[PDB]
Structures are given as C-alpha cells and as structure tokens.
C-alpha cells in the first residue's frame, strides 16, 4: 500500500480517457484493467477519489453493448460500493440511474453487481432511496421478482422493503 496508491493515481487519468474512447475494443481493455485495479484497497481508494474515473465507469456501464465491458464496469462499482467514499462517488456520479438500467440486463453477473450495489447504496447512502425511485427503480425491481433465483429474489425483496 502507498506505493500501490501512487502507481494507481498516475495511471488513472489515462485510463479515464481510454474508458471514454469511441473504440469499443479499447474501452473493454481499459475496463478489464480498471476492474483489476479495483480489487486492491490502495488503488480502489485512488479510483474512488477520482470523479472523472467514476463518471467514465458509470457512463461506460450504461452505454456499452459489450457484455464483458458491462460486467467489468458493474463489478467495479460493486467493489467501490463497499466503502463509504465509494458509495458517495457512485452517487454523485449519476451511478444510480445507470445501475437501475442494468436491472434490465439478460446477463447474470451484471444483474448481480447491479442489484447488490443498489442494495449497498439503499442501506448506507443518504439520498439513495429517492434517487432510485426517480430512476423508476421500484418498477424495474418489481419486474425482476418472477424472473430470478431465490438469492436475487431475497436481495431484491430487501431493496423493495427499503423503498416502498
């Protein structure tokens, strides 16, 4: 740690611009990397300290058509959501409506990261309940209830008890 921290901070601006690229091969690779970075606490802290990086992850998650890119950027928000500062950064970045949109994904890992991140925001982040409602999150959550396994159902039922 601390070495790792500064290493990340140096790379973060360029990763940001690559994540924002128009070429989806480039986006994908930069997303894999950002996801791998989010696995170590030091560099996870440098990701969460960068509004630009957080906004690029949110925007990519939401606009992408590549399954793997949606997975890795959703996974990354998931990892940030384990920290109070991560939650706040997702929230200020517009992460909530992106995450609610990923509740329509036919992909299991993505649904998974989206519902758990939303759960962590609903539990711990002031302002999250209203912003999930504003994004239509109650209906999108209710649409999943007959469509998922009993573990997703349980988490989603809990998000709903938080919101109703």
């Amino acid at each position: 740690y601390q070495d790792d921290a500064e290493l990340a901070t140096r790379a973060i601006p360029e990763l940001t611009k690559l994540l924002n690229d128009e070429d989806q091969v480039v986006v994908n690779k930069a997303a894999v990397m950002v996801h791998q970075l989010s696995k170590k606490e030091a560099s996870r802290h440098a990701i969460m300290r960068s509004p630009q990086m957080v906004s690029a992850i949110v925007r990519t998650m939401q606009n992408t058509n590549d399954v793997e890119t949606a997975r890795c950027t959703a996974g990354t928000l998931h990892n940030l959501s384990h920290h109070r500062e991560g939650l706040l950064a997702i929230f200020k970045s517009g992460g909530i409506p992106a995450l609610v949109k990923m509740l329509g994904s036919p992909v299991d890992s993505v649904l998974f990261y989206a519902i758990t991140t939303l759960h962590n925001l609903l539990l711990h982040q002031e302002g999250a309940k209203m912003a999930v409602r504003l994004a239509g999150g109650l209906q999108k959550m209710v649409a999943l209830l007959n469509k998922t396994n009993v573990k997703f159902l349980a988490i989603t039922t809990d998000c709903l008890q938080i919101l109703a």
Binding site: E14, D23, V25, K29, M33
Partner: peptide
C-alpha cells in the same frame, strides 16, 4: 476485421500500446 479505416486501426494500435504500457507499470 471490424472493417476499420486505417486511421481507426492506427488509433486502436496506439491505444492498445498505451494500455500495455499501463499494464506494465501496474504489472
């Protein structure tokens, strides 16, 4: 392949190289 123009193929290659540079720095 994706039927990129040469200008797109050049941008793809320079971006992937920088990514390899960053992957190297981050090991």
């Amino acid at each position: 392949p994706d039927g990129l123009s040469q200008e797109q193929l050049e941008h793809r290659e320079r971006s992937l190289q920088t990514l390899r540079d960053i992957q190297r720095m981050l090991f």
